[PDB]
């Protein structure tokens, strides 16, 4: 793919999500979603192979169905009130349809099935865009209509997402599927606090985006897509392995690492209004995410797996293309807990 | 190759007394080992231990136990001289306590 | 609501179910998507005409435009799938698992 | 009290900026100096605690623990510089960094005046210990041990956080002084019962309780020497300190709610004392002895009387010192023989007389010989339990006998008898090991000279 | 400006530097032939850059200084031990084969990068497309097992598919008895142990697999021992060829851009050589790996980046 | 020495070094001036001095 | 969200003029020091990743890191302080405006408050 | 004498497509090293 075509497709994706996030008209939001999907489909197929083709096909089918139900919800809401503005959306049926459509766009359970497969099919660079950037628009639309969200449906889907991500991540050896299941669990975590306070949703989104970015750029630095391939980089770049272990610890939610800040905050926000059982369930379930992060860390840096002979040649060559924002992402992903109160600047 | 790894043979134990009859068991280099032993003994037994113990033994009576004893002597003397009971059952004045009016 | 609105909504629901069933082929699901879009167009234009929303009359046309894009997109992917397998069957899209 | 916190954060870069062959000397010297400085917190008012600032305060219960940690770090550094001789400079510096970070987190844990900050640091202590155990262990089981040592903690402590924030939403504050002054009784309801369980279970599993002790033998066996020292000497006392700080609000629900935990603690103390007898390993025996002593401390905290609190503090300090010394003594033999079996190396008194003397003193202090502070704490707890109920003495008495038995059993198995006839690589004891033993044992006697420093705030 | 997507966006293209004289030339021959001198003469006459055959320490001459490193740090294999004891139980044969294939892959990447960046052609002495003849010779003689050749096939399949075959392949055909006579007359004490069956298997694999496969994508110019000395004749045959059958005329600017981005950044070139396949011949334990890596790091100019080593006399470090 | 061109040369890229140093200095003086203006504005608004 | 919709709120200001009446954070604020420390850590990690002498590879790069982190942290702290001050102001105004919902209850002394006693035995 | 480190037998547990292999997933193959499946011999 030509670099000009690639950069204009990326700009079109960003323009679509900007149009979603700056529009007060429902039709313009739908147009932004359509533009985002249309310009995102070829990005997944930048490296051509049958797996990439089928991942793009599944992603397109899921997004098209979600857009269809989103437009039906918009039309019903217009039918019961001649209003186009993105607002309360009083109608329960239209609100349920919009909630389901945005859940499928986000990947929340039980609409999660497409997330692990597509991430597996696409390249790491493509995957990073899918897991990080493709969550802003549905979350923004959800935040704008959060006051009308039925708590039962949203909380049930969030809890299902957390449970399913924790259980699915326990079995995968491929790194991309592990990242996808972790993304599902994190989406559940942020979605849970949405009906109560959207500021915590935004904070969790920012921290998850930073952590996922650092994870993916570290994975790109040591070009490994499997556990065994990642077990070799201790013999080439030990510093990458150590940073990767620290980032995995942060993603697990352990204090004093930055990853503890959202969960804690979310729990606090859910305790202010008599919700006790649900945060406890979320913590005990995120223990599973911590477990499989710990297994990855054990395989990666805390032990030394056997290496190969040809690795000696790799000792003589340096990494040419260097990512500029990796150290900043790592630092913001780990050592940013003491600046917790700054979240007040998010409202 | 009837094996699985190109592994190094397991090294045998290294004895610090072989190349250094007076080793002290701190390091292979005799000079740094001797100085490590000296600083450990000086800052563990000489500075921290004895000086810390003699500093703890002479801490000022901030726990107020000699003061409590003197106060007790004065109060006992006064109360016994005036014939008052040595100790009063009520810790606070009943006049400042307002019980509920009735229990029916 | 009159019977026309409910008939259009039932048509949309039928098209959605047909898309979600996925019998054997891929062109059938694209046809189901196009049918869902047609039902949405009809519902939107009926609602717009009934309430005399003058400015909203161009809303359906824009709808149709993006419909074409979706169709084109799907067709493109279908072609690639065929060129990989010689058949547009959905059974062949199983290289990636959960 | 930043005059103690800052020197640790300066120990970090100077360790990272030292020469390749001078890291141990600098670390040991400056850790000893920091311990000497921290020895100044023992001057405690009898009225209230020392409140340095809005975040850090020191009580009569916090000061002995702080002194113990600051004294512990040099001993761990001395014990760690034997099996790390073949390591590279960067990994040695990383090991020292883990030790320094653990000490810093413990120091900031023992003096945090707010419960959420205390929880944050009490959980931040998990990362360095886990890294040490799973990176610098020796056997293949260490990974499994680490997993246990993590989850057995977290599953018990994640609910506590919720309870904590819930309290902050009800009372309005989590500061310890405000919590103590504005404390109100808890009514008998299922909600309050589960609040009690959430507040208690984390510190119960950190002791650990008899039913939740399965992680302790694994963690203490597969860890390196310094990890075992820090786990058995200070990291166990976190649960006791947390319970002693948190039981203020739990009244009066504690009197009803303490029966299952008291029963478990007593019967598990008996069971672990009995288990110590039929042990083929050497470190597992010390681990189970630690479990028994911590069960006694749990009983003391649960009955909630001033004599019980004094005995609990004394027993905590004494057990920390004694278990550290025992682990070091076992590690010396392990380095000699490269095996953990107890009956492998026998009759070591005829080959290592001074080490035999150290073994005898450690075993004597382990079985609560008078007038050592071990017996002081044990006897105070026993008297408090007897006041609680006259039958408890039976169980306590039983434990005492069993304790002595297994202690002497170990002292007889490894030191007395005849040598194994085929271990010819038992070199004479180095000066470092003897110095470590002396620095472990002398503070115990110096403290039994002046016990009021380690009797806690109820004195 | 280092080549990249931006440099491709404005200005620099690849097809505008090819002057019809790129002609990636690969010279092939059996053991102890005149292929080396023929390659040098062809490079001199045609004005192309000569690439000597990739040895065990080829990668050492591209990084740091050209001085080769110790055999423990680079290679971990020797040709003399393979000749003396081909059936050794330490897995030296396949370790040497895999290391040589990786070195040839690196050399091919270097040659392609030079041709794409400059436009001047290259003349190689043996390519990755003809490295399998030695593998088949070892396998048929029982020197290596079948799992070794399976691992080699997997690595070749995942690596060699990203590059373009040479424009023209030149083969020097020499009979086995003449090869044996030249080996005996050479004088190296180790090469006298090469059995006749090994050379026969090499030439059989060549003539049966390499040339028929290359004839479908390139132009093959077979020669003999007698006609391999007059390099002017072979140069005339090379310059009077018809290059219209290979994929080279079917390359667009985007394909050349992708290939140029791939040939540089040698880490991506060597990525798939160290696949996590655990063969006893090539797998190395954790302890030995750690020891050898620590030994390699302590080299005078290998601790830091090639510009941040004060040991080798680099200055102004604190401002770079 | 190095047989390769060593893109990081024996002397630093003085253009980038100058740009970075100038950016740091400009940011520092901008922060100083902004803080001075902010404290003056706060004092004027609150009428302290 | 509670403060997203507020009367007289310019959408993308990030620092309303009304915020200029609050005292600016001192340049030696501990949070600014922590931001500078974060910048230094990021610079050290950058040096480590590129395989350079970690402590003293590039002084200008580390200086730029620290300066950028401090520069962003100053305005972040200003906005955070403004937001907290606005929250406090709104809470006090609403409490004053609705006296019936926040009444002044009686002030009883412990001499007349009857608290049931729980013996420990 | 030395700290235990993983060997080939310990490493091969993380080589399959998924962990915890059941009978149904025992025939699942790991993906190719490069994410390119071999072309199928589709007779058209
Ligand atoms: C009451 C006695 C009064 C004595 C006055 C002087 C006291 C000096 C105390 C010094 C501090 C203790 C040092 C312990 C480490 C050992 C050092 C060492 O290696 O020496 C080698 C040195 C050279 O020998 P070597 O030839 O190299 O040895 C080769 C082999 O190792 C072979 O070596 P070994 O076979 O000689 O083994 C060493 C030897 C001795 O080594 C030890 O066992 C040391 C440990 C002692 C017991 C520890 C467990 C009990 C803890 C009690 C804590 C009390 C604290 C008091 C203050 C302590 C201040 C430090 O073994 C024993 O004697 C048997 C030990 C069991 C003793 C049982 C005592 C029961 C309690 C007694 C009452 C205590 C309170 C009295 C007042 C009560 C109120 C009226 O020999 C000695 O120095 C022996 C020391 C003398 C024995 C002291 C025994 C009693 C100590 C009680 C504490 C001090 C009391 C002071 C107040 C006045 C009373
Ligand atoms: C708060 C929320 C924060 C945002 C959430 C996270 C955002 C994530 C963005 C995903 C972007 C994916 C990506 O670029 O790869 C990640 C990339 C690693 O990927 P890689 O393997 O180095 O990429 C290989 C190239 O994409 C290989 O591609 P190529 O060689 O075919 O492309 C040529 C190259 C060179 O581009 C050109 O030649 C420019 C030509 C100008 C033509 C103008 C045409 C205009 C229309 C006519 O263009 C690019 O590399 C990508 C340009 C993207 C432009 C975006 C404009 C907006 O690292 C990052 O982008 C940084 C990640 C964090 C970004 C900052 C996040 C906080 C702000
Ligand atoms: C609360 C208080 C503060 C605490 C906050 C946390 C600590 C501080 C912040 C952390 C970030 C800053 C530094 C991190 C980046 C450094 C990268 C690095 O690798 O360092 C190597 C580097 C040595 O490399 P070299 O000298 O270039 O030559 C040797 C080669 O590099 C040869 O290198 P190599 O690659 O061949 O060595 C192999 C090694 C290479 O791998 C590594 O070295 C590991 C790198 C560390 C991981 C980075 C994590 C990112 C930050 C997150 C921290 C989490 C904190 C929460 C607590 C949980 C801890 C996990 O890999 C292994 O050995 C694998 C073993 C597996 C161990 C698993 C543990 C890994 C995680 C440990 C993290 C601990 C926290 C960081 C402590 C500082 C570490 C430098 O260390 C240094 O020399 C710099 C260290 C810092 C310098 C401080 C000096 C300050 C200014 C001096 C004067 C002081 C004031 C004067 C004024 C006085 C008034 C007059
Ligand atoms: C090898 C050879 C052995 C045999 C040879 C021995 C030679 C003779 C030595 C034996 C001496 C006999 C002992 C007789 C007792 C004399 C000393 C005693 O009387 O002093 C005590 C003093 O004891 C000290 O208080 C001990 C303090 C404990 C020191 C702490 C350890 C140092 C810190 C190191 C780290 C340890 C961490 C522990 C965590 C808490 C009494 O204290 P107290 O009567 O009331 O106060 C007196 C001063 N006043 C009245 C002005 C107030
Ligand atoms: C976890 C680390 C995250 C770091 C994020 C990246 C940091 C560097 C990026 C540079 C920051 C500049 C971005 C914005 C500056 C100018 C734009 C400004 O106008 O935005 C306004 C205000 O700016 C943003 O709102 C806040 C930006 C502040 C980001 C910091 C929050 C980080 C979380 C706290 C953890 C501590 C992190 C420390 C970082 C070093 C928007 O106001 P408004 O139109 O009304 O919002 C509508 C949407 N709402 C109400 C629902 C929110
Ligand atoms: C090593 C493993 C150890 C595991 C220990 C885990 C068990 C910890 C004990 C339970 C923890 C959860 C309790 C909740 C936290 C306290 C919060 C609270 O007190 O709020 C209660 C709410 O209490 C609850 O909802 C608790 C529900 C419990 C759900 C999760 C059950 C977990 C397992 C139950 C048994 C565990 C106890 C024994 C375990 C022993 C160890 C094996 C009051 O509700 P309000 O909203 O204020 O309304 C009251 C006025 N109308
Ligand atoms: N893949 C390989 N396996 C084993 N040996 C190889 C391989 N590739 C090259 N060699 C060795 O390289 C040596 C030199 O190559 P050759 O062309 O025969 O000699 P010369 O350089 O004099 O022309 C040969 O002895 C050959 O065995």
């Amino acid at each position: 793919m030509n670099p000009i075509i690639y950069t204009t497709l990326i700009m079109t994706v960003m323009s679509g999500t900007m149009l979603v996030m700056i529009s007060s008209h429902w039709l313009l939001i739908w147009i932004g979603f359509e533009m985002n999907l249309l310009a995102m489909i070829p990005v997944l197929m930048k490296n051509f192979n049958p797996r990439a083709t089928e991942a793009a096909t599944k992603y397109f089918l899921t997004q098209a169905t979600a857009s269809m139900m989103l437009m039906m919800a918009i039309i019903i809401n217009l039918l019961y009130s001649g209003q186009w503005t993105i607002t309360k959306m009083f109608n329960p049926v239209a609100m349920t349809m919009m909630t389901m459509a945005l859940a499928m766009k986000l990947g929340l359970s039980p609409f999660h099935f497409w997330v692990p497969e597509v991430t597996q099919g696409i390249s790491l660079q493509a995957g990073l865009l899918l897991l990080t950037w493709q969550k802003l628009a549905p979350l923004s639309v959800l935040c704008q209509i959060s006051q009308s969200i039925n708590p039962n449906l949203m909380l049930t889907m969030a809890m299902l997402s957390i449970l399913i991500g924790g259980w699915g991540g326990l079995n995968q050896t491929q790194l991309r599927k592990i990242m996808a299941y972790s993304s599902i669990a994190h989406m559940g975590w942020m979605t849970a606090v949405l009906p109560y306070n959207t500021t915590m949703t935004i904070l969790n989104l920012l921290i998850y985006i930073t952590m996922t970015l650092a994870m993916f750029m570290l994975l790109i630095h040591s070009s490994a897509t499997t556990t065994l391939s990642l077990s070799h980089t201790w013999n080439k770049m030990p510093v990458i392995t150590s940073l990767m272990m620290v980032t995995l610890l942060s993603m697990g939610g352990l204090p004093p690492l930055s990853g503890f800040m959202p969960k804690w905050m979310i729990i606090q926000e859910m305790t202010k209004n008599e919700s006790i059982i649900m945060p406890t369930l979320m913590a005990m379930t995120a223990l599973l995410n911590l477990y499989f992060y710990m297994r990855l860390a054990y395989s990666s840096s805390l032990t030394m797996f056997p290496s190969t002979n040809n690795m000696k040649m790799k000792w003589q060559f340096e990494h040419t293309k260097q990512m500029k924002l990796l150290p900043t992402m790592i630092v913001l992903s780990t050592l940013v807990l003491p600046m917790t109160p700054a979240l007040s600047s998010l409202n | 190759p009837t094996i699985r790894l190109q592994e190094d043979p397991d090294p045998e134990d290294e004895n610090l007394y072989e190349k250094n009859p007076d080793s002290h068991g701190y390091d292979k280099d005799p000079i740094v080992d001797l100085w490590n032993m000296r600083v450990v003994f000086f800052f563990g037994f000489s500075i921290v231990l004895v000086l810390g113990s003699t500093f703890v033994a002479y801490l000022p009576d901030y726990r107020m136990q000699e003061w409590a004893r003197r106060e007790a002597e004065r109060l006992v003397k006064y109360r016994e001289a005036n014939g008052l009971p040595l100790m009063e059952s009520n810790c606070f004045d009943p006049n400042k306590i307002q019980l509920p009016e009735d229990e029916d | 609501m009159p019977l026309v609105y409910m008939n259009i909504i039932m048509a949309f629901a039928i098209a959605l179910a047909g898309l979600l069933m996925y019998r054997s082929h891929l062109m059938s699901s694209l046809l189901c998507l196009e049918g869902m879009m047609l039902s949405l167009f009809i519902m939107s234009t009926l609602i717009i005409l009934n309430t005399h929303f003058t400015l909203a009359n161009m809303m359906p046309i824009i709808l149709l435009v993006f419909a074409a894009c979706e169709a084109a997109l799907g067709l493109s992917l279908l072609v690639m799938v065929s060129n990989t397998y010689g058949t547009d069957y959905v059974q062949n899209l199983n290289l990636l698992q959960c | 009290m930043l005059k103690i916190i800052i020197p640790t954060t300066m120990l970090l870069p100077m360790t990272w900026m030292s020469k390749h062959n001078m890291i141990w000397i600098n670390a040991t010297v400056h850790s000893l100096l920091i311990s000497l400085i921290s020895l100044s917190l023992l001057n405690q008012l009898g009225e209230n605690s020392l409140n340095f600032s809005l975040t850090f305060f020191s009580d009569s219960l916090s000061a002995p623990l702080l002194v113990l940690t600051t004294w512990l770090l040099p001993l761990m550094l001395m014990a760690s510089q034997s099996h790390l001789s073949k390591e590279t400079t960067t990994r040695k510096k990383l090991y020292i960094t883990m030790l320094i970070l653990l000490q810093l987190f413990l120091i900031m844990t023992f003096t945090a005046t707010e419960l959420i900050l205390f929880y944050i640091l009490f959980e931040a202590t998990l990362v360095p210990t886990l890294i040490i155990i799973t990176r610098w262990g020796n056997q293949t089981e260490r990974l499994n041990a680490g997993l246990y040592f993590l989850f057995y903690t977290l599953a018990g402590s994640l609910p506590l956080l919720v309870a904590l924030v819930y309290i902050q939403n009800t009372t309005g504050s989590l500061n310890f002084l405000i919590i103590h002054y504005w404390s109100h009784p808890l009514s008998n309801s299922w909600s309050n019962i589960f609040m009690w369980l959430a507040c208690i279970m984390a510190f119960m599993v950190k002791m650990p309780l008899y039913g939740l002790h399965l992680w302790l033998p694994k963690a203490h066996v597969e860890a390196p020497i310094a990890g075992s020292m820090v786990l058995a000497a200070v990291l166990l006392k976190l649960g006791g300190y947390g319970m002693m700080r948190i039981t203020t609000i739990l009244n009066p629900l504690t009197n009803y709610m303490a029966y299952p935990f008291l029963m478990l603690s007593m019967w598990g103390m008996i069971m672990t004392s009995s288990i110590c007898l039929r042990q083929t390993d050497l470190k597992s025996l010390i681990a189970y002895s630690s479990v028994s002593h911590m069960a006694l401390v749990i009983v003391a905290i649960m009955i909630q009387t001033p004599w019980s609190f004094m005995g609990a503090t004394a027993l905590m300090i004494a057990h920390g010192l004694t278990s550290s010394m025992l682990f070091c003594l076992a590690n010396t033999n392990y380095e000699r023989v490269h095996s953990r079996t107890m009956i492998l190396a026998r009759g070591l008194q005829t080959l290592l007389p001074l080490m035999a003397t150290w073994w005898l003193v450690a075993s004597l202090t382990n079985l609560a010989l008078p007038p050592s502070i071990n017996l002081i704490g044990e006897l105070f707890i026993i008297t408090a339990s007897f006041s609680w109920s006259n039958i408890t003495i039976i169980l306590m008495g039983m434990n005492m006998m069993i304790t002595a038995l297994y202690s002497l059993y170990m002292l007889i198995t490894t030191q007395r008898g005849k040598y194994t006839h085929h271990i010819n690589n038992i070199k004479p004891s180095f000066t470092r090991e003897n110095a470590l033993m002396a620095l472990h044992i002398l503070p115990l006697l110096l403290l039994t000279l002046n016990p009021k420093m380690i009797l806690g705030p109820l004195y | 400006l280092q080549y990249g997507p931006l440099a491709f966006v404005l200005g620099e293209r690849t097809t505008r530097k090819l002057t019809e004289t790129s002609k990636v030339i690969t010279v092939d021959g059996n053991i102890c032939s005149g292929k080396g001198r023929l390659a040098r003469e062809i490079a001199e006459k045609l004005g192309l850059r000569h690439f000597p055959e990739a040895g065990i320490h080829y990668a050492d001459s591209t990084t740091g200084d050209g001085k080769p490193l110790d055999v423990q740090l680079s290679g971990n294999c020797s040709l003399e031990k393979f000749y003396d004891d081909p059936k050794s139980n330490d897995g030296n044969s396949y370790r040497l084969q895999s290391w040589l294939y990786a070195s040839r892959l690196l050399q091919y990447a270097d040659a392609l990068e030079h041709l794409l960046s400059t436009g001047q052609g290259v003349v190689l002495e043996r390519s990755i497309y003809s490295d399998f003849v030695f593998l088949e010779a070892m396998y048929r003689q029982g020197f290596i097992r079948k799992q070794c050749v399976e691992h080699y096939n997997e690595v070749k399949k995942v690596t060699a598919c990203e590059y373009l075959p040479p424009h023209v392949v030149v083969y020097v055909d020499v009979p086995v008895p003449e090869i044996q006579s030249r080996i005996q007359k050479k004088g190296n004490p180790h090469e006298m142990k090469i059995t006749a069956a090994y050379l026969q298997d090499i030439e059989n694999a060549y003539k049966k697999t390499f040339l028929p496969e290359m004839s479908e994508k390139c132009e093959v110019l077979q020669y003999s021992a007698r006609e391999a000395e007059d390099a002017e004749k072979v140069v005339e045959d090379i310059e009077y060829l018809k290059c219209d059958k290979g994929p080279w005329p079917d390359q667009d600017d985007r394909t050349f851009h992708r290939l140029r981005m791939l040939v540089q950044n040698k880490l991506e070139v060597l990525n798939y050589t160290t696949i996590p396949v655990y063969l006893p011949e090539i797998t190395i334990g954790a302890h030995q790996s750690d020891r050898v890596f620590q030994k390699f790091t302590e080299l005078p100019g290998r601790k830091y980046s090639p510009g941040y080593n004060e040991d080798v006399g680099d200055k102004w470090i604190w401002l770079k | 020495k190095f047989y390769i061109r060593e893109p990081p040369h024996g002397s630093p890229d003085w253009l980038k070094v100058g740009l970075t140093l100038g950016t740091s200095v400009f940011l520092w003086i901008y922060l100083i001036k902004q803080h001075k203006e902010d404290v003056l504005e706060y004092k004027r608004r609150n009428g302290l001095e | 969200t509670m403060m997203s919709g507020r009367p007289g709120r310019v959408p993308l200001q990030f620092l309303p003029n009304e915020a200029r009446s609050l005292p600016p954070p001192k340049l030696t604020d501990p949070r600014l020091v922590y931001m500078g420390f974060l910048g230094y850590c990021s610079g050290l990690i950058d040096n480590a990743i590129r395989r350079r002498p970690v402590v003293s590879a590039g002084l200008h790069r580390q200086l730029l890191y620290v300066t950028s982190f401090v520069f962003f942290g100053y305005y972040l702290l200003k906005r955070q302080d403004y937001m907290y001050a606005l929250r406090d102001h709104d809470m006090f105004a609403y409490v004053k405006s609705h006296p019936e919902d926040f009444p002044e209850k009686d002030k009883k002394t412990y001499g007349e408050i009857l608290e049931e006693f729980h013996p420990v035995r | 004498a030395r700290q235990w480190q993983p060997d080939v037998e310990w490493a091969e547990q993380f080589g399959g497509a998924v962990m915890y292999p059941t009978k149904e997933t025992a025939h699942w193959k790991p993906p190719p090293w490069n994410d390119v499946d071999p072309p199928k011999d589709t007779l058209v």
Side-chain angles (χ1 to χ4, degrees), chain A residues 249 253-258 260 334-335 337-338, chain D residues 97-109 115-132 149-150 153-154 157-158 206 235 238:
Chain A
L249 287 189
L254 299 184
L257 293 325
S258 159
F260 178 69
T334 63
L335 313 160
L337 189 78
Chain D
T97 297
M98 302 285 123
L99 296 184
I100 291 168
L101 282 178
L102 195 47
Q103 184 210 289
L104 174 65
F105 286 154
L106 282 168
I107 278 181
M108 293 199 319
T109 299
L115 281 188
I116 274 297
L117 177 60
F118 159 76
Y119 170 88
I120 282 181
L121 303 155
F122 153 86
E123 300 292 334
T125 54
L126 272 179
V127 175
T129 314
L130 173 65
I131 287 168
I132 286 172
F149 163 73
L150 190 69
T153 308
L154 274 189
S157 74
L158 260 305
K206 262 275 190 177
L235 285 201
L238 279 181

Side-chain angles (χ1 to χ4, degrees), chain H residues 16-35:
Chain H
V18 311
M19 326 207 51
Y20 312 156
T22 69
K23 219 302 172 163
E24 206 263 311
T25 61
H27 312 304
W28 283 16
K29 287 326 170 328
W33 310 110
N34 59 332
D35 294 330

Side-chain angles (χ1 to χ4, degrees), chain E residues 31-33 35 53 79 83 96-97 100 104 126 131 134 138 191 198:
Chain E
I31 301 194
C32 199
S33 291
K35 68 165 194 53
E53 197 183 3
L79 191 60
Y83 282 145
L96 163 80
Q97 187 51 46
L100 281 180
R104 292 207 163 92
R126 209 171 265 138
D131 193 274
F134 302 100
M138 297 168 171
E191 302 208 331
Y198 184 68

